[PDB]
């Protein structure tokens, strides 16, 4: 123990860390799903398969 | 809820009567069978002229005279 | 790099950039003609919808 | 300019015809630059709150990068859509108006006379 | 963070905990009035939280490890060199007074933060409303200039207007001869160099300027030296007060919410202590400020924010 | 156009120049904004009642509403000027000149 | 202010701007402007001192006069067109009156006489609301009436705004008056390209709002309202001096920064229309804006003005402020020029 | 000259506007604005708007009573300027009246005039409808349609009046 | 006063010197009235006599600038026999700048206004020659 007062950022806010990692993982999987749907729709509308 | 109601009726009875009358005016037209007849009377009040139709040949619901049996009637307003 | 490589790469660069330059001149001329005449899909400033017009028989006949 | 195009279909970020176009790659250097902007935002965020800039908040830096890549992907889709619309309307207007765009006869330089201006 | 407008919206009203024990009490008096135990005695009768008098190193005691920093990082001043050379060329007198005013502003912010967050009253010693009497004694003794008084009045005019007075102000009548006797019995060799006229000017700005303007906005309790030795009589006089003056009565949830949003932000509390008034006593030049700031960054626990320091043992930094 | 629109637009311009030239008294010009609202009311209402565009007949009422809905605003801003200073003179409001 | 009332009043300011943006009827445009003014007056009087009351009085009088001229333009349009659609105006008199009304609401010169006064009188957050969010509804109406805007009028207003907003900020040491004359010059830049390509008007509006929101967020994060108090920032938080350096060099129109993006594109659209003199004078006159930006960078970042002793206490306390989107806006205001063809999304 | 009755009431309207626009004192400013708003409900009442004239009369009577109370409470001086006390009031009052009756003289002698727009000089009886509206006054039907058709207008107007009360109570606090 | 500049420019250079001088005098007088109106607007003169003195001073200053500009330009176009030539308006702009210096009673303002107003009048003549547009109509 060093600090004379318990700081606001002494421990990581595990709710906020969980929200951050869940939001980031959701945005990556939704981005990759959207891109796969977009390339499949491009290859369907142009017959480039 | 009854003790608070008695308290506000003892202290501010004008406001109790106000919220009671306002609550009735909110909820009670949705619980009346006569609210339909208000609209039916208002749309059966003939301000404009009933502009007639050119008889093409196939209009069985439109009469050729006001005293014909087909057409919209107002017997519901006469009886009520 | 070979002189062949630089030479034919320069020809590819010149094709791409001359096509872009001709398309920019076409783009300026198309913008000028569409603003002047108003018959293209651009510069279509809004007018009134005619679906808003009521064509019912009104109160007085002369309309 | 193109405001009358997007007036029959209002407030569409990406219309249906935008699906007839190739989407940007996930290795698009424009998208990699937007992800680099997300990483720089994470670094400035750790700098202004006096955190260690490279070590603190890797989840927060990663959500900065993820959020900028996610927004920038759709921004690049709408960018590529609007330039494809610009070219489509250009080519259709040139095709529907041949009298305004005559086919030029490019003369060779054996007939083209240019005045020589000597540098002496 | 912990408090904000959303906490105020979701039900945390700060008069739901404002009880009759929530009394901000400031004990005042001359240099050796014997108030130093008295305040603590009040804080062990009324169940209040005692704050010691803000020295140079009060901000050192609130931040970091609580240990006092070296004086070039906090203060750049010395009370003992003020006692030795009051008319010094380096301007230690007003520099010490300005640092003590900033420290008391910080202490009064800590007092109001405790009072508005926990509902426990705070017993202070010489708050910011009584800090000007030492400035005026130093100016009457010619220790400082008139520009120093104008700088202090500008800083006080733009800082004290946002705060409330205490509920109770306790003052201890000790004459100048008894103050000098307690200084001679104290044993501090620097403190024995205090002149009689400086003590007399402290007592004059007390009895002539401080108490006649504080008796309207709070409740004075002026005791002598022998009756301040018995804390039970003082606390008995506190518990039977009729709190009717001052602007604490017309404080709703909204005003105390705005005060609490000001008070918990310490850089907004200390915003106007460093106003750009270039005065030779307090203006530190560019190279010295750069050197002392870069030496302050290299201190343990001071290089980053208060939970982000590997050299003091902060873990899980990559998830914070 | 018709003869009455000359004088209603004339009254708008008279109230415009009365508003836009202050006589060092803020209430005397808050009357001029209310007069501009009156002139806009009568002008729009003459146009709407003339052409029998009946559905815009609710428009001047709405217009008139926002009239007092800013006029009251001005009066709520008149009393703060006349509490800082003993008068509502507009030349007391020159602190933001520096 | 009670935070529920603050939320409702800010949502009502936003509601007034949205009602201007989404409505097809002139009376609803006017209602949106009235609602916007009416709700933003207590944002200006958040502190209840005589300078906020003076600023609110001047703002009420200017915006009320502008709304009178706007409703007169609407009624003359009703006469000469028999309709209420928000589109081009069917009379040059109504066109002039509505252009004057919107120029007063933007604070464009020679109607600029309220923007440094009102911006200095109010806090930095309400000054941010004034200089960013209130520049969205008149720019909507100007975007919607550009087939009827007089060319000479909007170009005179534009270049007069650029010149007066350039010369005004040179004589200033207060940061809010600097940002207000910066506002005047930038609204001149936005409206000069309005009849040539209004996509560049929207581009300049968005880049300006990003840079101005960055600068006001930096001022609020440092709690600085004067030049000489901004000059103490190197002794307290030296990263903030770097951020105001890069943002003020961005606002001057220097490459490779994003504030060079609108200006250049505006020149790129005015030389297409065979106007060479006018964007040249505009570019040269923007050097005045760059000069007082460089004055602020000299006082803040590139040199070290002398600080005080009490700054040593503020070394021991970090910022607990909500610096909302400050790294995002700092990155977007400086490093967005390689993404310059993104402006096509504003078409 | 009775066919010119809306024109004559409009002359009295402009005279009231020159009366309060010269700004003598808000007592007499309220007087002149009551006179103008009371002949303006006679201008617009001769076009068919009997509901829509009585309301601009009544709302402005309440408004000028409030403005009277404030100019007796806040905007009061020891010697209020009646119409003629100041030379700058009387000068622009006479100026507005002479220019108004000048454009009266130029429009009855010539039967056409042009200030920015072009205006006729015939009596404005000429432009009325030669038909009847039946068993409804049409302006009453249009203002009645504020509840059936004007629902969004109701919502934004009632919200603006609600936040007008909230805004005014937030301004007139002082702290 | 769109027609003031038109009736200035609808006259061939070096033909009728009195009407050119009068037209440029009226252009200068309108500019001086605009400057006088804003000057009595934003900065309150101490009396009505002082206000009309400032108005007449600025109006006669700018009208004398316009008169000597048009006179010098048309006399130079007569004696040099080069009507479509910007050096005529360079000399005329320097004459107007010396006029402005003589009205401000100083030599440095005269030389600076000579240089910049001569360059400005030369650019105006070049714009009249090549058809330069400052308020250009939108074409694309
Ligand atoms: C990158 C650029 C942006 C960096 C922002 C943060 C900088 C920072 O804080 O650094 C501190 C940090 C070191 O700090 P520390 O030791 O932790 O503690 C803080 C110190 O105590 C520092 O001490 P202090 O803070 O207590 O006080 C000293 C003070 C010192 O300050 C002063 O003394 C005042 C100023 C001095 C004079 C001015 C000098 C110039 C400063 C401005 C720059 C201008 C040029 C830029 C272009 C023109 C713009 C006008 O401040 C600093 O030293 C702060 C450092 C700032 C340096 C960088 C400035 C960034 C903003 C400006 C450039 C970017 C925007 C514009 C670019 C436009 C296009 C080119 O530096 C780094 O870590 C640098 C980065 C190194 C690793 C980079 C790895 C990159 C990996 C990329 C691949 C992976 C991601 C892939 C993504 C895509 C996936 C698809
Ligand atoms: C549709 C259009 C959407 C546009 C973006 C909307 C969101 C950003 C703007 C709104 C805002 O003010 O956000 C506050 C902002 C935090 O305020 P701050 O002061 O900037 O943050 C400082 C610290 O990072 C605060 O740290 P902390 O201690 O609170 O904890 C970490 C925190 C924890 O937050 C969470 O865990 C959030 C969890 C809930 C997420 C929502 C699900 C429900 O995560 C972050 O702060 C991550 C970085 C946030 C970046 C904000 C900007 C995002 C991109 C904006 C557009 C950039 C366009 C570039 C284009 C370039 C070319 C033109 O972000 C959040 O609270 C969450 C951001 C989520 C981004 C989602 C993006 C995709 C949306 C679809
Ligand atoms: C033909 C008709 C059409 C022409 C074009 C349209 C007309 C407008 C022209 C452009 C604007 C001119 C400037 C107007 C404002 C004047 C400045 C002022 O207020 O001064 C008072 C005051 C100066 O007094 P002060 O500060 O107490 O100090 C004075 C000293 O104590 C004592 O010092 P002092 O004794 O030396 O007196 C000072 C005064 C004395 O200056 C004079 O008496 C000189 C008067 C002009 C001389 C040059 C005339 C040249 C004419 C052209 C050549 C003729 C032939 C042309 C042939 C064809 C072309 C080749 O000098 C100044 O005020 C200097 C600044 C203004 C320079 C104006 C130059 C105009 C050139 C026009 C060329 C055409 O300054 C201010 O208050 C400045 C702040 C004003 C802020 C707002 C300004 C807004 C201006 C808007 C004007 C346009 C409105 C557009 C409406 C439509 C869009 C919404
Ligand atoms: C235009 C004419 C100048 C008007 C403003 C002059 C400055 C204000 C002034 O008169 O203050 C005195 C006076 C009161 O001020 P003060 O406190 O006594 O200050 C003077 C001191 O007493 C000190 O005593 P002083 O009078 O002996 O010293 C003043 C000094 C006298 O100068 C000297 O003592 C030494 C300089 C000798 C003459 C300058 C030689 C310049 C040579 C050409 C430059 C290099 C060109 C290189 C390339 C050549 C080939 C292209 O004159 C100046 O500082 C004026 C400099 C030039 C002003 C225009 C610069 C525009 C730059 C735009 C960007 C490029 O104010 C007035 O009289 C106000 C009214 C001024 C005239 C009304 C406006 C006329 C506008 C006509 C139409 C303009 C159209 C646009 C032209 C410009 C844009 C293209
Ligand atoms: C849902 C239906 C529609 C309701 C909205 C429409 C209302 C129409 C009538 C207009 C009312 C406008 C004015 C209302 C003001 C209410 C707030 C108020 O005045 O609170 C204070 C009052 C006590 O007064 P006090 O604090 O002493 O004030 C100083 C002066 N003595 O506090 C009180 O008196 C207590 C107020 C709360 C308790 C009232 C309980 C009334 C119950 C009546 C029966 C149930 C009716 C149905 C609705 C549900 C009610 C909970
Ligand atoms: C960050 C951008 C987030 C966008 C979310 C979706 C918004 C949306 O649907 O926008 C529709 C609009 C295109 O619709 P449109 O009717 O053409 O509007 C142009 C206005 N003249 O799309 C746009 O206007 C896109 C561009 C908006 C960019 C604003 C911030 C930069
Ligand atoms: C020329 C001339 O007479 O200049 C003198 C004049 C100042 O005259 P003064 O001293 O007031 O009598 O001086 C001025 O008015 C200022 C300078 C007049 C113009 C000088 C032009 C040439 C300067 C050198 C240019 C080098 C390149
Ligand atoms: C730095 C400043 C550089 C300024 C460069 C100005 C270049 C001249 C541009 C204006 C000009 O003179 O254009 C020529 C034009 C006459 O040609 P035209 O367009 O045919 O006019 C007939 C009207 N349809 O003329 C006109 O349209 C009217 C005359 C314009 C005069 C502009 C200058 C006024 C005085 C100086 C301010
Ligand atoms: N503003 C001030 N200026 C100078 N000395 C002070 C100031 N405030 C407190 N002191 C000193 O702090 C000490 C307080 O005495 P004590 O009662 O022992 O706490 C005495 O030495 C005072 O002189």
Swiss-Prot record, chain F:
Main location group: mitochondrion
Compartmental location: Mitochondrion inner membrane
Entry's transmembrane regions: 1-21, 29-49, 61-81
Pfam family, one: Oxidored_q2
Catalyzed chemical reaction(s): a ubiquinone + NADH + 5 H(+)(in) = a ubiquinol + NAD(+) + 4 H(+)(out)
EC number: 7.1.1.2
Domain of life: Eukaryota
Any GO CC annotation of this UniProt entry: respiratory chain complex I
Swiss-Prot/TrEMBL keywords: Electron transport, Membrane, Mitochondrion, Mitochondrion inner membrane, NAD, Respiratory chain, Translocase, Transmembrane, Transmembrane helix, Transport, Ubiquinone
InterPro entries in the cross-refs: NADH_UbQ_OxRdtase_chain4L/K, NUOK/Mnh_C1-like
Membrane topology: Multi-pass membrane protein
Molecular function GO labels: NADH dehydrogenase (ubiquinone) activity
RNA-binding is among the record's keywords: no
GO biological process: ATP synthesis coupled electron transport
Coiled coil: none
Subunit annotation: Core subunit of respiratory chain NADH dehydrogenase (Complex I) which is composed of 45 different subunits.
Family of this protein: Belongs to the complex I subunit 4L family.
Protein name, UniProt field: NADH-ubiquinone oxidoreductase chain 4L
Organism of origin: Ovis aries
Gene expressing this chain: MT-ND4L
From Swiss-Prot, chain G:
Membrane-crossing segments per the record: 3-23, 25-45, 67-87, 96-116, 122-142, 145-165, 178-198, 200-220, 237-257, 274-294, 325-345
Catalyzed reactions: a ubiquinone + NADH + 5 H(+)(in) = a ubiquinol + NAD(+) + 4 H(+)(out)
GO cellular component, one term: mitochondrial inner membrane
EC number: 7.1.1.2
Identification of the protein by name: NADH-ubiquinone oxidoreductase chain 2
Enzyme category, top tier: translocase
Protein function: Core subunit of the mitochondrial membrane respiratory chain NADH dehydrogenase (Complex I) which catalyzes electron transfer from NADH through the respiratory chain, using ubiquinone as an electron acceptor. Essential for the catalytic activity and assembly of complex I.
Complex and partners: Core subunit of respiratory chain NADH dehydrogenase (Complex I) which is composed of 45 different subunits. Interacts with TMEM242.
The family this protein is said to belong to: Belongs to the complex I subunit 2 family.
Gene Ontology terms for molecular function: NADH dehydrogenase (ubiquinone) activity
BP term (GO), one: reactive oxygen species metabolic process
Swiss-Prot record, chain H:
Entry keyword annotation includes Phosphoprotein: no
GO molecular function, one term: NADH dehydrogenase (ubiquinone) activity
Enzyme type, top EC level: translocase
E.C. designation(s): 7.1.1.2
Alphabetical UniProt keywords: Electron transport, Membrane, Mitochondrion, Mitochondrion inner membrane, NAD, Respiratory chain, Translocase, Transmembrane, Transmembrane helix, Transport, Ubiquinone
Biological process, per Gene Ontology: mitochondrial electron transport, NADH to ubiquinone; mitochondrial respiratory chain complex I assembly
Subcellular location: Mitochondrion inner membrane
A single Gene Ontology CC term: respiratory chain complex I
Signal peptide as annotated in the record: none
Transmembrane segments: 1-21, 25-45, 47-67, 88-108, 149-169
Membrane topology type: Multi-pass membrane protein
Domain of life: Eukaryota
Catalytic activity: a ubiquinone + NADH + 5 H(+)(in) = a ubiquinol + NAD(+) + 4 H(+)(out)
Family annotation (InterPro entries): ComplexI_Subunit6, NADH_UbQ/plastoQ_OxRdtase_su6, Nuo/plastoQ_OxRdtase_6_NuoJ
Record's subunit section: Core subunit of respiratory chain NADH dehydrogenase (Complex I) which is composed of 45 different subunits.
Family label: Belongs to the complex I subunit 6 family.
Role summary: Core subunit of the mitochondrial membrane respiratory chain NADH dehydrogenase (Complex I) which catalyzes electron transfer from NADH through the respiratory chain, using ubiquinone as an electron acceptor. Essential for the catalytic activity and assembly of complex I.
Protein name per UniProt: NADH-ubiquinone oxidoreductase chain 6
Lineage of the organism: Eukaryota, Metazoa, Chordata, Craniata, Vertebrata
Name of the encoding gene: MT-ND6
